[PDB]
Every structure is written in C-alpha cells, then in structure tokens.
Design a protein around this ligand. Structure first.
Ligand code: ZN
Ligand code: ZN
Length: 157
DNA sequence: CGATGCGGGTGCA
DNA sequence: TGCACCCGCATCG
C-alpha cells in the first residue's frame, strides 16, 4: 500500500520485500521478509543502541554517533578514522579513553542528532510473514566502521 | 568482553 | 501519552 507507520494494523499484500539495507538513512522504511536473517537480527551498519519505548512489539533503537580522532588526524593515504562506538554503555566509556590507532592522540565521541537534534532512531516490528522497518532522521555525522570492520580490529595482534 | 533485548522507573512536553 | 534516557537482568557468540 502507501501510508505506513507503527499503525494499528499493517497491510499484508506485500509483494515487494525490499532487500536488506545496510545504511538506512533519510527516514527510510522497508518491508524485509521475516526469513531475512539480517533483518531478523535487526542489523544496521550505523551504531544503534537499544532504546526502551515500553512496547514489546516495536523494537526501537537510537544512533550512537561515531568515534573520531579529536586531533583531526589523517593517515598517509589521506584516510580519516571513524571508529564504531561500543554499544554496551560502560564499554563506550572505557573506549573514549583509549588512544587513537593512527596518530596515537585522544579519541572523541561525536554523537548523532539527525532528528530535531536527537540521535536518529529506527523501529522494528515483525508482522507475520515479514519484518517491517522504519526510521526517523538523517545522520548528521560520518559513518562508523561496520560491526564486521570493528571486530576486525579487536580480533587482531 | 561486549552485542542485543527487555522492562522498570525518571524527567519533560 | 510520547519521547529520551539511566540502570540492572539475562542470553549468547
Ligand atoms: Zn588520530
Ligand atoms: Zn546517526
């Protein structure tokens, strides 16, 4: 159909089950199939943290921002550093203290707010044959490394 | 260690 | 009633 939100009931003549989106931005809405393993795990390559909206039916999550090198540093091939923020709150504290992996300077956590000045949010709800997606905002800060990229660091020498 | 989900409880419109 | 958010509980890779 056309209109879509967190409404009472969601239409179900879905023919177009969008393919899993990695970087939902600009208020994107989707209809991923519920067999979609990445849609099941409510993934996003943006660092999104769980948010409690008191509703077991709508999984809401808000954007953490992105960790950058406060010293504005840039590698040799002109690469800037955007670390993926830790999701566990206490971990992000211990993280902002760690030194930059490039210029060994201090790290700074730039937060998101591409929504009326508040961290961009997402919304997941499973309605039978599929998982519906909807977000509110547009990230006003550079993209972190992916869960996949981030883990590449930690799992090294 | 942390990613993720959950939900009680708070402070502001 | 909505929304943002702090805090602890629990699971699981
Ligand atoms: Zn640096
Ligand atoms: Zn963002």
């Amino acid at each position: 159909l056309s209109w879509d939100i967190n409404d009472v009931k969601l239409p179900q003549n879905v023919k177009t089950t969008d393919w899993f989106q990695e970087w939902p931005d600009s208020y994107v809405k989707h209809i991923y199939s519920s067999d979609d393993r990445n849609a099941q795990r409510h993934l996003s390559s943006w660092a999104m943290r769980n948010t409690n909206n008191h509703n077991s039916r709508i999984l809401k999550k808000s954007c953490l921002g992105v960790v950058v090198c406060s010293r504005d540093c840039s590698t040799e091939e002109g690469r800037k550093i955007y670390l993926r923020p830790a999701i566990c709150d206490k971990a992000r504290q211990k993280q902002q203290r760690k030194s930059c992996p490039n210029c060994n300077g201090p790290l700074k956590l730039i937060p998101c707010r591409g929504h009326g000045g508040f961290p961009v949010t997402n919304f997941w709800r499973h309605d039978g044959r599929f998982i519906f997606f909807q977000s509110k905002g547009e990230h006003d800060h550079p993209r972190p490394e992916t869960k996949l990229e981030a883990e590449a660091r930690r799992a090294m020498k």
